[PDB]
Write a protein that binds this ligand. Structure first.
Ligand code: HEC
Ligand code: HEC
Ligand code: HEC
Ligand code: HEC
Ligand code: HEC
Ligand code: HEC
Ligand code: EL6
Ligand code: EL6
Ligand code: SF4
Ligand code: SF4
Ligand code: SF4
Ligand code: F3S
Lengths: 929, 261, 104, 45, 169, 157
C-alpha cells in the first residue's frame, strides 16, 4: 500500500542532442526481422524513442504478411529480460569484452600455426548472408576448420529427404494459395515454423467463407498428436506416428510412383481415409499438395516429393529453389560428428553461437562430457544458458533488436536486422564475434554488414539501395532461383520392417516454447498451450483409450522410461490423440534458464536418441506419482450443450443448400432499458472462427500491447491468469476422434453490458463510440463486474501482478518497487495496473484513440485500415477483423451481414459488438459417415 | 474472543498488505467467503430486529426479554458484517468512492448497482440499529445509574443515559418514537437483506437471476437469525440465572417463527 | 419466480380490505353483534398498510430484477405491460396503488 | 478465507461479552411493564 | 542550478514552438534538449554559472533533470495538439507563462476542472490563430463566439467528450 | 492520497530513467537506421540533387509552392528562424545582435546566390556557429516552406 499526500517530484528529462527522427509521443515503426530457426519472419517493430515496445508484422515481407507468430511476438520480454546475460563471463566469474578479444586472438594465432584445426563452431542452422560470408571467410583463412550446425527442430529429415529423392539438396517452398486439398502427413505447418505465418494465411485465404463461396480447402492431416493445424484440418486422423511412413506408402501407390514398396498394413479408419485423400489428389492435380513435417523419417519426405511430382504440383504449388540455408546436410548427425571429434582432445577452440547444446543434445550424443575437454570453449547467447556455465568463455547475445544483422527468409528474400535500440548490455552479436576470430576485432557490426552489401549490389547508387532495404525491410534482388529437379527413381525400394508392438513416444516442439531457446520468456510460458490449455508445465499427452489401459487420471506423474533414460513426466490425457502414442514436448526442464524457465517441466531432450529423434516405440510408462499441480486455464474442455452460443459448427455439404443454416431467425428481443444512439465511430469486431487455428499469437500480442502481467504457475491453477483474449477448445464428438473447435472469447463490448450496471463507483462505462471503457483508476476492486459478465472476460488483478516470474506475487516487500529493465517493454499508452483493479479487452482503445484523435487534428474521419488492433495486426490467418460499424464501406460491416454472423450468448440481450463467423469444416462425402 | 480478534486483525493486516488474492477467489468465482460470510452475518442480525422491531408492531410481550440480546446481536452481526463490504474490495482504501460526496472529480457512485445500495442499506442498517438499541438503553441505563452506589460507574451510566427521569411527557414521546422506529426498522430489514439479495439477483447468472430472491433471502435471514438468538440464549440461561425471564415459552415461540421462516 | 408471490401479497390486500369493508356495511346498517374497538381497527389498518407495502415490495422487486438484467425470456412480460397503453397502468400501480395508499 | 471468518466470531464475541458485562442483556423497563401487565390482568379478576 | 526563466526568453520573440516543438503534432509537449539551449548559450552567456548546468550537460551526456510542475498521473493520458488544433490556447491551462519567472501550476489539474471545460468548451475555446498568443484574454462576448467556434471546429458534444476513453486509457 | 497508478511501471515520452548513463529513457537512435514512415533519401527530403551525401544543392524547391504553404512557412519562419535572423530577414533579431559571428543577413549577395537546397542544408544540419535545426522542425513540408518564405522574403528589400 503506497500512500503519500503528494506524488513525488517527477523529473522530465529531454535529450542532450535530440535526433531528427524522434517525436516524443509518436510510435516510429522500424522494419527489421527475427532469425527464428535460421530464416527471417520479417518485422515492423515499434520503437517509441529508442526502446522497442511492440513487435508487429512487416506487411511487405513474404513470410509474415503483416502478422507474426506466438513466439515471434513475445521476443520483447526476451529482449527486456532481467535474466539476460548483462556481462561476459570467463570460467564462472564476470569479466570484460576486451579481455575476450585478448584471449581469443591469442588463441587465433595458435590456430594459424596449424591449419586452423581446432576451430569448431556450433551455430544453429543460419541462413543470413553476412554470417555465411563471414564463415566462408573463416573457412578460407583456416583451411581445416569445420562449421557444424546443430538445430533440434532443424530441417534435418526434410533436407535428407530432398537428398534422397533429388540428388543434391533443394529447398521446398510450398504455395497454398493455389491448393484445393492439402494432404498433410505429420506436418504442423501452421506452427511456429520459418514459414508458419504464410502457410496459415494461404490456407485461410482458401476458406474465407462468404455469401457466394462454394469451394474451400480440405486439409487432410493424419497427425500424430493434436497439432494446431488440426484445428484447421477437416479430416485429421490420429495416426500412431509410426504408421505415417505406411500411410504415405499406401498413398504413393494409389498415385503413380513405380518403386514405392508398400508394407505394414493399415487399420479400417486409416485406409478409408487414405483411399479418399488420394481420391481427392488424383482430381484437382494442378492445385493440391502433400505436406510432411520433420517428425517423419527421410524416406517419406522423399516420397512426399515423389507424390508432389507425380500429381504435377512442381512449378504450380511446390516450387523448388536453391537451398537458402548454407549447410542443409548438417543436423543432429553434425552434432554427433562433433562430440566424437570433441572426445580425446583434437579440438582447441569451440565457438558456440546460440544453440545451447548442453541442454539440447540427444542422450546418445554425450555433449556434456565432450565439453570441458576443449581448452577454450566460447559461447555467444543472450542468456547464461545450460552451456554458458559449462563453457570456458561466455559472451552476451545481442538480441536482434540490439544488433546490426541480416537474415534470409524462405523465398530467399533477405531482410536487414536493424538495431532499434543500442545494446543495453554490450551484446556483441554473432557477426561481431566472428570478427574477433577472423582478425578484425575493432570492426563493428555495421562496418561488416555494409562491407558485404557493397559487394553484393551490382547496381549503382548503393545509398539509395541500402536505405530502401532498411525502409521496406525486404530486398528482393536476392530471391532464391528456381531449380530444375530430376526426382530420381529407385529410392524407396527397401521394404520397411515390422511395425513393432509397444507404446510409442512422440517428440514435439511446444508451440509456446519451441526448443527451449525462449523458455525464459514469461509471455510464452503463461500463454496457454493450444489443445491442452496448460501454462507452466511440460506434460505427457495420452489418448483417452491409452490412459484407460494404463489406469491413470489427468494429473498423475509417470516415469517415462525410454531406451535407457527416465524423465518423471506428469500426464495430461487428450481426446484427439493417437493410441499408445505418448507425446512429450521440448522446451522444459532447463536448469539455468533464469527465473522464469528454471525447473518448470521435464526435459524431453534427455530422451532423444539421435537415431529415433522424433518418435520411438520402446516406452514404458510406469506411474510413480499422484496429484501434480498442472495449472490449466480452461476448466472444461467439453461443449456442454452450449452450442448455438460458443462455436456453431457445420459442414459445407449443408451450407451449399442453406446459407443461414447456423443462424436462428428469431424475433427481436425486448429490452426495458431502451437503447442508445451510436452515430459516430461505432466500433465492432468480427472473429472468423472457421480460420482460427488456435495459434495463440493474439493472446501474446494483447499481452505485449496492453501491458498485461504474467501470472505464475501457483496463481494460474487458482484461475487468476491475466489474459484479455482467450481461445477455447471444445472437443465435440467421440472421446477418441473428436472435433476440436476454437472460440476466440474476448470482451464482446456488449451494448447492454451487464458488467457495467453492477459497478458501484461506475468504473466501467461506455463510449459514445460504443465500446466498453474499463477505467482502472476508479476500480475499487469489488469483483461484481466479473460476476455479471456472462462470458467471464473480466480479469482481476488479485495480488500485485507485476514482474511475477521475477518476484513471487505473495509479498509486499517489492510491491510498489518494479524491475527497471522491464519498464521499457511496457506500452506507454496502457495503464500498468495496480494491485486491486479489474482488466478487460478494451478493443485496444489506446490504438483507437491514437488514430481517432489524430484524425480530429487533421479534420478528417478514420478510414478502415487506419485502426488495426493488436490481436488483428498479429493474426496470421486474419481471423479477427476490427473496424467501424457506421462506415458503410467498411470491412467489418461486410463480415457482420454474412449468413454465418452469430453473436455469443444471444439468449441474453447483451447485444455484443463482437460477432463470430461460424465454423464450416468441409467434410468429404466418402468420410462423413 | 481476543484470540479470535487477533486472528481477525491479523487476517486483515495480511489482506491489506499482500492483497485480496490470498483468499482463493478465482476469476470464474470471484465472490467467495468474503461474500458468503457477509450475507450470512447480515442474515444473522436481521431476526435480531424482527425480535426488536417487527414484533413490537404486533404489541407482543414475548419479544420483551429477548429484546436486548437481539438488538445488540444485530449490531455485532453488522459490525462483523460491514467490514466485509469494506475489505472484499481489492483497493479497500477507496470504499469512500461508493458514497455520494462532492469532490474535485466529477464522479459519483453509480446507483444502479446493488452493491452501491449495500452501502445505502447497511450504513442505514448499522446506524438505526445503534439508534434503536441506544434509544432503548436511554430509560434502562437510568436504572443502572440509580443502582450503582459508586460515583465513577454512576457517572458512566449517568452520561450514557442522557438524564431521563421517566415522566409521562417523556414516556409518551418515547414510545411514539419507538413504534415509529419499530415501524421504520420493519421495512428496513425486509429491504436490507433484500438489497443484500439484489446483489445476486440483479446479475444475469442462471442461479442468481431468480426473482424470488428478495423474499426468500429475508426469510433465510429470519431463519438463520432466529437460530443465532436460540444458540446464544440457551447458554444465557444456564450460565446467567435467567430461568425466570427467558422461560421456555420464549423458545417455543422462537422455534415456531424459525419454523415459519 | 415471485409471480405467485405477487398474488399472495395481494390476497392479503383484498381480504384485509374486505375485512374492513365487511365490518363497515355490517356497522353502518347496525348489524354487527359487537361494537368495533377503535384500537383493533387500528390493527386492521396496520395490516392493510403493511400489506400495501409488502405488495409494492414484491411487485417492484419482481420488476427491479427483470429490468436490471434484461434477459429476453424475462422482459417480454414487462415489455408487453409497459408499451401501448399498458404503460399507463404501470404508472398507476406505483402511484395510485402504492403511493396514494402509502401516505393516507 | 477461514481465518477471517473464524476470526470474525472473535469480533462478535469481543463485543457481545462487552455487551453482557457493561450493559443489560434484558430491557429492564419493558419487562417491568410485562410484570405490570401480568399484575394488571390478575387484578381484572 | 540557474534554471529556466520563461519571462526573459518569451520576451526575446520566441513564439513558444521554438522550444516545445510538436505541441501541434504530438500527444506530449516537448521540453527542449540541451542542443536547443546551447544553440544560443554556446556564446550568449557562455562561461556563466547560471547556465553552467547546461554546459555541463553538453560536455558530458547527462540529460537535464528538469522538474515537472504539471505532473498528471499516468492513468490520465493527456493529449496535447488536440487542444491547439481544436482551438485552445496555452493560457487557461498554464497561466501567463510569458509573465512567469519560474513556472508554477496555475490550475490544480483536477478532474472536475477539465470536465467543466469538456462539457462546456465554448467558454474557453479561442481561435487557432491566437492559440500561441499569450496575451489573449477572453472577450466579454465569449459565448456566441465560443459557441460559434465549437460548430466551426466540429468540436464534439459533452456526451462523447466525457466517457473515460477520452482520458483514462 | 493513494498513488496506486499515479506513477506506473512504464516510461512516458520524456520521463527519467534509472538504467542508463544519461538519465533519459528517451534513447538515441542508431546512426544508420531507417524508420518506416521516413525513407529520407530523395531530392525532397535532402536539399541535394539525388540525395547524395555530397550532392549538388537543388536550386529550386522540389515540392509545390501553394499560398497556404507560403503562409505556413511565414508562420514557421517567425517561430524558429526569425528569433535571431529578424522578422524581415535582416539578421536584426534580439539575439542576433548578441551572437559573435552575427547571423548573416538574408538580402546579402552571398545568401542570394546561395542555392535553395543549401538553405535546406543550413536548416536541417546547421552552419558553423548556428546549431542544427530540423529536429525542431521535423517535417519536410515545413522545412521547404521556411525556405519558400525566405525566397519570397528575398524580394522585398
Ligand atoms: C501551448 C501549446 C502549450 C505548451 C507549450 C505546453 N502546454 Fe501543456 N500541459 C497540460 C497538462 C494537463 C499537462 C500535464 C500532462 C502530463 O503530465 O502528461 C501539461 C504539460 C505540459 C508540459 C510538460 C511535459 C514535459 O514535462 O515535458 C509542457 C512542456 C507543456 N505542457 C507545454 C495542459 C495544457 C493545456 C490544457 C488543455 C494546454 C492548452 C496546454 N497545456 C498548452 C501547452
Ligand atoms: C536564443 C534564442 C536562446 C536560447 C535558445 C536560450 N537562451 Fe537563455 N538567454 C538568451 C539571452 C539573449 C539571455 C540574456 C543574457 C543576459 O545576460 O541577460 C539568456 C539568459 C538566460 C539565463 C539567465 C537569466 C538571467 O540572468 O536573468 C538563463 C538561466 C537561461 N538563459 C537559460 C536557458 C536555458 C535553460 C535554455 C535552453 C532551453 C536557454 N536559456 C536557451 C538566449 C537564449
Ligand atoms: C525555449 C527558450 C522555450 C520556450 C520558447 C518556451 N518554453 Fe516552456 N519550457 C522550456 C524549458 C527548458 C522548460 C523546463 C523548465 C521548467 O521550468 O519546467 C519549460 C517548461 C514549461 C512548462 C512546465 C512544464 C512542466 O515542467 O510541467 C510549461 C507549462 C511551459 N514551459 C509552457 C510554455 C509556454 C506556454 C510557452 C509559450 C509562451 C513556452 N513554454 C515557451 C523552454 C521553453
Ligand atoms: C539563432 C540561434 C539562429 C537561428 C534561429 C537561425 N540562425 Fe541562421 N545563423 C545563425 C548564426 C549565428 C549564423 C552565422 C554562421 C557563421 O558561421 O557565421 C547563421 C547563418 C545562417 C546562414 C548563412 C550560412 C553561411 O553564411 O555560411 C543561413 C543561410 C542561415 N543561417 C539560415 C537560417 C534559417 C533557414 C533559419 C531558420 C531555421 C535560421 N538560419 C535560423 C543563427 C541562427
Ligand atoms: C478527461 C476530461 C477525463 C474524463 C473523460 C474522465 N476523467 Fe477521470 N481524471 C481526469 C484527470 C485530469 C484526473 C486527474 C485528477 C487528479 O489529479 O486528481 C482524473 C482522475 C480520475 C480519478 C482519480 C483517481 C485517483 O485519485 O486515484 C478517478 C477515480 C477518475 N478520474 C475516474 C473517472 C471516471 C469513472 C470517468 C468515467 C467517464 C472519468 N474519470 C473520465 C480526467 C478525465
Ligand atoms: C487537464 C486534463 C485534460 C485532459 C486529460 C484532456 N483535456 Fe481536452 N479537449 C478540449 C477540446 C475543445 C477538445 C476537442 C474535442 C474534439 O475534437 O472532439 C478536447 C479533446 C481532448 C482529447 C482528445 C479526444 C479525442 O477524440 O482524441 C483528450 C484526450 C483530452 N481532451 C484530454 C478542451 C479542453 C479544455 C478547454 C480549455 C480543457 C481544460 C481540457 N480540454 C482539458 C483536458
Ligand atoms: C477495518 C475496516 C477498514 C475499512 C477500510 C479499509 C482500509 C484499508 C487500507 O487503508 O489499507 C491500508 C494499507 C494498504 O494497509 C497496510 O499497509 C497496513 C495495514 C495494517 C492494519 C492493521 C489493522 C487492520 C485494520 C483494522
Ligand atoms: C468503518 C468506517 C466506515 C463506517 C461505515 C460507513 C458509514 C458511513 C461513513 C461516512 C464517513 C466516512 C468518511 C470517509 C472519509 C474518506 C476520506 C479518505 O479516506 O481520504 C483518504 C486520503 C488518502 O486522505 C487524504 O487525502 C488526506 C489525508 C490527511 C487528512 C486526514 C483527514 C482525517 C479526518 C480527521 C481530521 C482530524 C484532524 C486531522 C487534520 C489532518 C492532520 C494531518
Ligand atoms: S462482454 Fe463481458 S466484459 Fe465485455 S462489455 Fe459485455 S459484460 Fe462487460
Ligand atoms: S482488441 Fe482487445 S482482446 Fe484483441 S488484442 Fe487488443 S486489447 Fe486484446
Ligand atoms: S485469432 Fe488469429 S492469432 Fe488468435 S488464435 Fe486465431 S489465428 Fe491465432
Ligand atoms: S464492479 Fe466496479 S469498482 Fe472494480 S472490479 Fe468490478 S469495477
Amino acid at each position: 500500500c503506497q500512500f503519500a499526500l503528494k506524488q513525488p517530484q517527477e523529473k522530465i528529462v529531454p535529450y542532450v542532442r535530440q535526433p531528427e527522427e524522434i517525436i516524443h509521443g509518436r510510435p516510429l515503426f522500424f522494419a527489421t526481422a527475427v532469425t527464428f530457426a535460421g530464416f527471417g519472419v520479417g518485422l515492423l517493430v515499434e520503437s517509441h524513442e529508442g526502446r522497442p515496445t511492440k513487435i508487429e508484422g512487416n506487411p511487405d515481407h513474404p513470410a509474415s504478411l503483416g502478422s507474426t507468430d506466438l513466439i515471434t511476438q513475445a521476443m520483447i520480454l526476451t529482449m527486456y529480460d532481467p535474466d539476460r546475460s548483462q556481462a561476459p563471463t570467463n570460467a564462472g566469474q564476470e569479466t570484460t569484452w576486451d579481455a575476450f578479444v585478448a584471449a581469443a586472438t591469442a588463441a587465433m594465432q595458435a590456430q594459424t600455426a596449424k591449419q586452423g584445426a581446432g576451430l569448431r563452431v556450433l551455430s544453429g542452422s543460419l541462413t543470413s548472408p553476412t554470417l555465411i560470408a563471414q564463415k566462408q571467410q573463416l573457412l578460407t583463412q583456416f583451411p581445416q576448420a569445420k562449421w557444424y550446425e546443430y538445430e533440434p527442430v532443424g530441417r534435418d529429415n526434410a533436407n535428407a529427404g530432398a537428398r534422397l529423392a533429388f540428388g543434391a539438396d533443394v529447398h521446398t517452398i510450398y504455395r497454398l494459395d493455389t491448393a484445393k486439398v492439402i494432404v498433410g502427413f505429420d506436418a504442423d505447418f501452421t506452427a511456429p515454423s520459418p514459414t508458419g505465418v504464410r502457410m496459415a494465411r494461404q490456407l485461410a485465404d482458401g476458406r474465407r467463407i462468404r455469401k457466394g463461396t462454394k469451394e474451400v480447402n480440405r486439409l487432410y492431416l493424419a497427425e500424430s498428436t493434436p497439432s494446431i493445424t488440426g484445428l484447421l484440418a477437416d479430416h485429421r486422423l490420429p495416426v500412431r506416428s509410426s504408421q505415417i511412413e505406411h500411410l504415405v506408402r499406401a498413398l504413393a501407390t494409389l498415385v503413380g510412383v513405380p518403386n514405392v514398396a508398400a508394407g505394414a498394413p493399415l487399420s479400417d479408419t486409416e485406409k478409408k481415409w487414405v483411399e479418399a485423400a488420394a481420391k481427392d489428389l488424383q482430381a484437382n492435380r494442378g492445385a493440391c499438395v502433400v505436406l510432411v513435417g520433420e517428425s517423419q523419417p527421410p524416406v517419406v519426405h522423399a516420397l512426399g516429393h515423389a507424390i508432389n511430382a507425380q500429381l504435377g504440383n512442381v512449378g504450380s504449388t511446390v516450387v523448388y529453389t536453391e537451398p537458402v540455408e548454407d549447410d542443409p546436410s548438417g543436423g543432429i548427425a553434425a552434432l554427433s560428428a562433433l562430440t566424437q571429434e570433441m572426445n580425446a582432445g583434437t579440438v582447441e577452440v569451440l565457438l558456440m553461437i546460440e544453440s545451447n547444446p548442453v541442454y539440447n543434445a540427444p542422450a546418445d550424443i554425450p555433449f556434456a562430457e565432450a565439453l570441458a575437454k576443449v581448452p577454450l570453449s566460447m559461447h555467444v547467447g543472450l542468456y547464461r544458458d545450460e552451456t554458458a556455465q559449462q563453457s570456458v568463455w561466455h559472451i552476451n547475445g545481442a538480441h536482434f533488436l540490439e544488433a546490426w544483422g541480416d537474415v534470409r527468409a524462405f523465398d530467399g528474400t533477405t531482410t536487414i536486422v536493424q538495431p532499434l535500440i543500442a545494446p543495453l548490455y554490450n551484446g556483441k552479436s554473432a557477426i561481431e564475434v566472428l570478427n574477433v576470430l577472423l582478425g578484425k576485432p575493432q570492426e563493428t557490426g555495421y562496418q561488416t554488414l555494409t562491407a558485404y552489401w557493397q559487394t553484393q549490389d551490382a547496381s549503382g547508387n548503393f545509398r539509395v539501395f541500402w536505405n530502401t532495404a532498411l525502409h521496406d525491410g525486404v530486398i528482393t534482388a536476392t530471391q532464391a532461383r528456381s531449380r530444375q529437379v530430376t526426382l530420381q527413381q529407385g529410392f524407396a525400394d527397401a521394404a520397411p520392417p515390422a511395425p513393432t508392438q509397444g507404446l510409442e513416444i512422440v517428440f514435439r516442439p511446444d508451440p509456446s516454447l519451441w526448443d527451449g531457446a525462449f523458455a525464459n520468456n514469461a509471455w510464452l510460458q503463461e500463454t496457454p498451450k493450444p489443445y491442452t490449455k496448460l501454462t507452466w508445465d511440460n506434460v505427457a499427452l495420452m489418448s483417452v483409450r491409452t490412459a484407460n489401459a494404463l489406469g491413470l487420471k489427468n494429473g498423475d506423474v509417470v516415469r517415462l522410461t525410454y531406451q535407457g533414460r527416465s524423465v518423471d513426466a506428469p500426464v495430461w490425457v487428450q481426446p484427439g490423440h493417437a493410441d499408445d502414442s505418448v507425446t512429450v514436448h521440448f522446451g522444459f526442464g532447463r536448469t539455468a534458464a533464469g527465473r522464469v524457465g528454471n525447473n518448470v517441466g521435464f526435459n524431453a531432450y534427455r530422451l532423444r536418441t539421435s537415431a529415433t529423434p522424433w518418435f520411438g516405440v520402446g516406452l514404458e510408462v510406469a506411474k510413480v506419482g499422484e496429484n501434480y499441480k498442472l495449472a490449466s486455464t480452461q476448466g472444461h474442455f467439453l461443449m456442454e450443450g452450449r452450442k448455438k452460443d460458443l462455436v456453431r459448427y457445420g459442414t459445407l455439404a449443408e451450407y451449399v443448400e442453406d446459407e443461414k443454416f447456423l443462424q436462428v431467425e428469431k424475433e427481436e428481443p425486448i429490452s426495458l432499458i431502451g437503447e442508445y444512439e451510436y452515430n459516430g465511430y461505432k466500433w465492432g469486431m468480427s472473429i472468423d472462427l472457421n480460420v482460427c487455428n488456435s495459434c495463440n499469437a493474439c493472446v501474446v500480442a494483447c499481452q505485449s500491447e496492453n501491458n498485461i502481467p504474467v501470472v505464475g504457475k501457483d496463481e494460474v491453477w487458482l484461475g487468476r491468469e491475466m489474459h484479455w483474449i482467450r481461445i477455447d477448445q471444445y472437443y465435440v464428438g467421440d472421446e477418441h476422434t473428436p472435433n476440436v473447435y476454437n472460440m476466440v472469447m474476448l470482451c464482446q463490448q456488449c451494448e447492454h453490458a451487464p458488467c457495467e450496471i453492477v459497478c458501484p463507483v461506475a468504473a466501467t462505462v461506455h463510449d459514445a463510440e460504443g465500446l466498453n471503457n474499463m477505467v482502472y483508476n476508479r476500480c475499487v476492486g469489488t469483483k461484481y463486474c466479473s460476476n455479471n459478465c456472462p462470458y467471464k472476460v473480466r480479469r482481476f488483478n488479485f495480488l500485485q501482478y507485476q514482474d511475477v516470474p521475477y518476484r513471487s506475487p505473495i509479498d509486499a516487500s517489492t510491491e510498489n518497487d518494479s524491475i527497471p529493465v522491464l519498464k521499457m517493454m511496457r506500452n506507454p499508452d496502457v495503464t500498468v495496473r495496480a494491485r486491486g483493479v479489474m482488466e478487460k479487452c478494451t478493443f485496444c482503445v489506446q490504438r483507437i484513440n491514437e488514430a481517432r484523435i489524430q484524425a480530429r487534428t487533421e479534420n478528417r474521419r478514420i478510414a478502415d485500415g487506419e485502426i488495426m488492433t493488436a490481436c488483428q495486426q498479429v493474426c496470421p490467418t486474419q481471423a479477427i477483423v476490427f473496424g467501424d460499424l457506421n462506415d458503410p464501406q467498411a470491412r467489418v460491416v461486410d463480415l457482420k451481414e454474412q449468413p454465418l454472423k452469430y453473436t455469443s450468448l444471444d439468449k441474453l440481450n447483451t447485444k455484443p459488438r463482437v460477432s463470430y463467423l461460424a465454423k464450416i469444416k468441409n467434410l468429404n462425402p466418402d468420410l462423413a459417415e | 474472543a481476543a484470540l479470535g480478534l487477533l486472528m481477525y486483525l491479523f487476517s486483515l493486516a495480511v489482506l491489506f498488505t499482500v492483497g485480496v488474492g490470498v483468499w482463493g477467489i478465482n476469476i470464474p468465482v470471484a465472490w467467495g467467503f468474503d461474500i458468503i460470510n457477509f450475507v450470512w452475518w447480515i442474515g444473522i442480525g436481521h431476526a435480531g430486529t424482527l425480535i426488536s422491531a417487527i414484533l413490537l408492531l404486533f404489541r407482543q410481550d414475548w419479544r420483551t426479554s429477548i429484546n436486548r440480546a437481539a438488538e445488540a446481536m444485530t449490531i455485532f452481526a453488522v459490525a462483523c458484517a460491514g467490514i466485509y463490504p469494506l475489505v472484499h474490495t481489492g483497493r479497500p482504501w477507496l470504499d469512500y468512492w461508493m458514497l455520494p460526496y462532492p469532490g474535485t472529480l466529477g464522479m459519483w457512485p453509480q446507483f444502479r448497482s446493488a452493491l452501491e445500495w449495500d452501502v445505502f442499506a447497511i450504513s442505514t442498517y448499522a446506524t438505526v440499529s445503534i439508534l434503536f438499541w441506544y434509544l432503548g438503553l436511554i430509560p434502562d441505563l437510568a436504572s443502572l445509574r440509580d443502582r450503582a452506589t459508586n460515583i465513577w460507574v454512576k457517572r458512566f451510566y449517568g452520561f450514557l443515559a442522557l438524564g431521563w427521569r421517566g415522566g409521562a411527557r417523556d414516556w409518551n414521546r418515547y414510545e411514539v418514537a419507538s413504534l415509529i422506529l419499530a415501524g421504520l426498522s420493519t421495512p428496513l430489514v425486509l429491504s436490507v437483506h433484500s438489497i443484500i439479495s439484489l446483489d445476486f439477483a440483479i446479475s444475469q447468472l442462471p442461479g442468481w437471476h431468480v426473482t424470488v430472491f428478495p423474499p426468500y433471502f429475508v426469510a433465510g435471514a429470519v431463519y438463520c437469525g432466529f437460530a443465532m438468538v436460540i444458540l446464544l440464549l440457551v447458554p444465557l440461561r444456564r450460565w446467567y440465572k435467567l430461568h425466570d425471564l427467558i422461560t421456555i415459552k420464549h423458545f417455543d415461540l422462537m422455534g415456531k417463527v424459525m419454523l415459519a421462516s | 419466480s415471485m409471480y405467485p408471490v405477487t398474488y399472495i401479497a395481494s390476497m392479503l390486500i383484498l381480504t384485509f380490505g374486505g375485512g374492513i369493508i365487511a365490518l363497515a356495511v355490517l356497522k353502518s346498517r347496525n348489524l354487527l353483534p359487537f361494537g368495533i374497538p377503535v384500537d383493533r381497527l387500528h390493527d386492521l389498518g396496520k395490516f392493510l398498510f403493511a400489506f400495501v407495502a409488502v405488495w409494492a415490495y414484491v411487485n417492484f422487486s419482481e420488476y427491479l430484477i427483470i429490468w436490471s438484467g434484461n434477459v429476453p425470456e424475462l422482459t417480454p412480460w414487462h415489455g408487453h405491460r409497459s408499451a401501448g397503453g399498458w404503460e399507463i397502468l404501470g404508472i398507476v400501480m406505483i402511484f395510485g396503488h402504492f403511493l396514494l395508499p402509502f401516505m393516507l | 478465507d477461514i481465518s477471517l471468518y473464524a476470526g470474525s466470531f472473535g469480533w462478535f464475541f469481543f463485543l457481545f461479552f462487552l455487551f453482557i458485562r457493561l450493559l443489560p442483556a434484558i430491557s429492564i423497563f419493558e419487562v417491568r411493564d410485562l410484570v405490570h401487565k401480568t399484575e394488571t390482568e390478575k387484578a381484572l379478576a | 542550478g540557474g534554471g529556466f526563466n520563461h519571462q526573459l526568453h518569451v520576451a526575446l520573440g520566441m513564439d513558444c514552438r521554438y522550444c516545445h516543438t510538436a505541441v501541434e503534432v504530438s500527444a506530449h509537449a516537448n521540453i527542449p534538449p540541451t542542443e536547443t539551449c546551447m544553440g544560443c548559450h554556446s556564446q550568449i552567456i557562455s562561461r556563466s554559472e547560471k547556465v553552467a548546468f547546461v554546459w555541463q550537460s553538453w560536455e558530458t551526456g547527462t540529460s537535464i533533470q528538469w522538474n515537472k510542475v504539471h505532473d498528471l498521473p499516468k492513468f490520465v493520458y493527456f493529449n496535447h495538439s488536440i487542444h491547439v488544433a481544436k482551438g485552445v490556447g496555452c493560457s487557461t491551462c498554464h497561466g501567463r507563462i510569458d509573465q512567469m519567472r519560474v513556472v508554477y501550476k496555475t490550475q490544480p489539474l483536477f478532474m472536475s476542472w477539465c470536465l467543466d471545460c469538456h462539457r462546456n468548451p465554448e467558454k474557453y475555446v479561442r481561435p487557432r490563430e491566437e492559440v500561441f498568443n499569450m496575451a489573449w484574454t477572453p472577450p466579454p462576448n465569449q459565448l456566441e463566439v465560443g459557441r460559434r467556434l465549437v460548430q466551426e471546429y466540429e468540436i464534439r458534444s459533452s456526451w462523447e467528450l466525457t466517457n473515460c476513453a477520452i482520458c483514462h486509457r | 492520497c493513494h498513488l496506486e497508478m499515479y506513477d506506473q511501471a512504464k516510461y512516458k515520452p520524456q520521463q527519467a530513467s534509472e538504467i542508463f548513463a544519461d538519465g533519459a529513457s528517451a534513447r538515441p537512435l542508431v546512426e544508420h537506421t531507417v524508420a518506416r514512415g521516413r525513407l529520407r533519401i530523395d531530392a525532397t527530403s535532402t536539399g541535394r540533387v539525388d540525395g547524395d551525401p555530397n550532392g549538388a544543392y537543388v536550386t529550386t524547391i522540389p515540392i509545390r509552392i501553394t499560398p497556404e504553404l507560403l503562409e505556413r512557412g511565414a508562420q514557421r519562419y517567425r517561430i524558429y528562424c526569425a528569433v535571431c535572423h529578424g522578422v524581415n530577414g535582416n539578421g536584426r533579431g534580439q539575439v542576433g545582435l548578441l551572437l559573435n559571428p552575427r547571423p548573416p543577413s538574408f538580402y546579402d549577395q552571398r545568401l542570394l546566390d546561395m542555392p535553395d537546397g543549401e538553405y535546406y542544408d543550413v536548416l536541417v544540419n546547421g552552419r558553423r556557429t548556428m546549431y542544427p535545426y530540423g529536429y525542431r522542425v521535423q517535417s519536410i513540408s515545413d522545412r521547404w516552406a521556411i525556405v519558400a518564405h525566405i525566397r519570397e522574403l528575398q524580394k522585398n528589400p
